[PDB]
Amino acid sequence: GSFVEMVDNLRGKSGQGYYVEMTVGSPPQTLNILVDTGSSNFAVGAAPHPFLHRYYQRQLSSTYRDLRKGVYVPYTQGKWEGELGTDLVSIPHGPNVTVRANIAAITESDKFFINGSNWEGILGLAYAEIARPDDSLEPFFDSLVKQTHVPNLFSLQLCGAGFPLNQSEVLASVGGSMIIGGIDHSLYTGSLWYTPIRREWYYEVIIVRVEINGQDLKMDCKEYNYDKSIVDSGTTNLRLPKKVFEAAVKSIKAASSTEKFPDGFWLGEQLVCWQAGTTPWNIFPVISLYLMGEVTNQSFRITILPQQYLRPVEDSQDDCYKFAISQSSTGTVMGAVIMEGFYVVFDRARKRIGFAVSACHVHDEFRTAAVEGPFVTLDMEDCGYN
Numbered sequence: 145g146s147f148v149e150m151v152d153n154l155r156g157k158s159g160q161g162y163y164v165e166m167t168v169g170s171p172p173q174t175l176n177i178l179v180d181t182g183s184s185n186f187a188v189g190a191a192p193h194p195f196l197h198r199y200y201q202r203q204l205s206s207t208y209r210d211l212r213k214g215v216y217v218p219y220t221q222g223k224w225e226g227e228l229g230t231d232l233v234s235i236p237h238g239p240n241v242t243v244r245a246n247i248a249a250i251t252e253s254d255k256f257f258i259n260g261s262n263w264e265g266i267l268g269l270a271y272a273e274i275a276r277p278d279d280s281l282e283p284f285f286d287s288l289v290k291q292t293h294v295p296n297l298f299s300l301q302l303c304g305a306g307f308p309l310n311q312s313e314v315l316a317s318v319g320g321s322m323i324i325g326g327i328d329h330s331l332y333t334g335s336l337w338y339t340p341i342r343r344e345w346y347y348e349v350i351i352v353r354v355e356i357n358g359q360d361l362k363m364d365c366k367e368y369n370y371d372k373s374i375v376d377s378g379t380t381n382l383r384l385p386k387k388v389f390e391a392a393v394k395s396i397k398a399a400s401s402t403e404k405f406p407d408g409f410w411l412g413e414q415l416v417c418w419q420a421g422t423t424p425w426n427i428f429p430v431i432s433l434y435l436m437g438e439v440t441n442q443s444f445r446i447t448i449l450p451q452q453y454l455r456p457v458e459d460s461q462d463d464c465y466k467f468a469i470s471q472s473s474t475g476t477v478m479g480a481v482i483m484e485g486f487y488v489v490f491d492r493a494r495k496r497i498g499f500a501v502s503a504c505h506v507h508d509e510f511r512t513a514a515v516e517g518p519f520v521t522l523d524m525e526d527c528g529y530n
């Protein structure tokens with residue numbers, strides 16, 4: 145329905161992350177927390193760090209409980225380490241509840257915190273299977289559902305501005321909404337289409353067909369989900385398996401061939417700039433990802449524009465962008481630049497993910513993002529990797 149208390153409760157952007165305000169401890173300590181559908185730990189800065197102007201002070205919380213256990217979490221680009229405990233947690237622009245939740249107090253980290261991001265911790269919203277050190281550490285959302293009457297569902301509207309936001313603007317701007325326990329109909333247009341959650345660990349899905357401007361990429365659909373496909377608000381780019389990335393870039397280059405871009409642009413390293421207002425959106429193709437539907441032999445598609453996969457960056461008065469599609473060796477990742485096109489419903493209760501066109505997606509007068517269906521698609525279970 146309508147969840148006015150939670151609409152517009154996010155801030156941030158695709159490259160630095162989207163965050164929500166939370167409070168931890170008694171009396172409450174306010175912290176900004178990155179929303180991460182690609183992990184399952186609630187982990188907060190708990191010691192001084194050059195990029196933090198505040199952190200969780202366990203000694204100041206009367207409700208802090210020490211679990212006397214450490215946690216070490218390496219990931220591709222870095223790591224975070226800390227001390228496990230529990231405390232009372234609330235979301236000011238959220239459901240009006242307070243829960244007793246696990247908290248990893250981060251004491252050491254490498255390439256975790258981001259300078260100028262304005263967030264001090266992360267909220268891992270995925271399932272217990274991928275919680276660290278193991279699946280016995282109950283994730284926040286599981287605690288929330290068990291302890292309150294909050295429905296087992298949340299939805300995310302990540303709003304890309306379509307242009308660079310400076311330090312002051314990104315602090316003053318609305319970055320989107322996280323609706324806890326429901327679906328807010330003001331955040332999307334058209335219909336919601338659902339794809340099954342294949343397995344409850346990451347938010348894993350199955351892609352059954354890929355098009356570039358309606359042209360079928362024509363790969364064996366297992367390639368699109370090798371070794372998994374996930375929906376992850378904690379990754380910036382649309383990341384594709386090596387072979388899929390190579391075929392997609394070849395097709396995107398062919399569609400946009402009226403202009404030549406350097407190799408560094410396609411590698412997502414170098415920006416491309418145009419005179420103010422002259423970005424040639426129309427030369428770049430739309431990208432359609434077909435997802436397995438809830439009905440046997442039925443699929444639907446989500447279509448994104450270059451306004452989603454070209455990420456605005458400051459250079460001058462030129463309009464500059466980075467290519468936000470990159471290679472992966474760990475499967476497809478539908479990151480923030482993809483999520484910015486859609487209102488995404490994480491329907492844990494019904495083991496499904498919903499997509500609808502976002503009321504805040506960036507587009508032009510000629511094209512819009514789309515969510516359409518149904519399409520007849522056979523042997524979709526074969527698209528999943530084992």
Ligand SMILES: CN1C(=N)N[C@](CCC2CCCCC2)(C[C@H]2CCC[C@@H](NC(=O)Nc3ccccc3)C2)C1=O
Pocket residue numbers: 161178180181182183184217218219220221222255256257258266274276376377378379
């Ligand atoms: C993809 N991804 C993700 N969605 N969450 C994590 C952890 C995954 C988790 C999966 C289950 C097993 C354990 C690991 C963490 C990520 C969160 C967003 C901010 C990032 N911070 C930076 O990247 N910071 C940074 C800072 C300076 C330089 C470079 C990067 C760090 C990750 O790698």
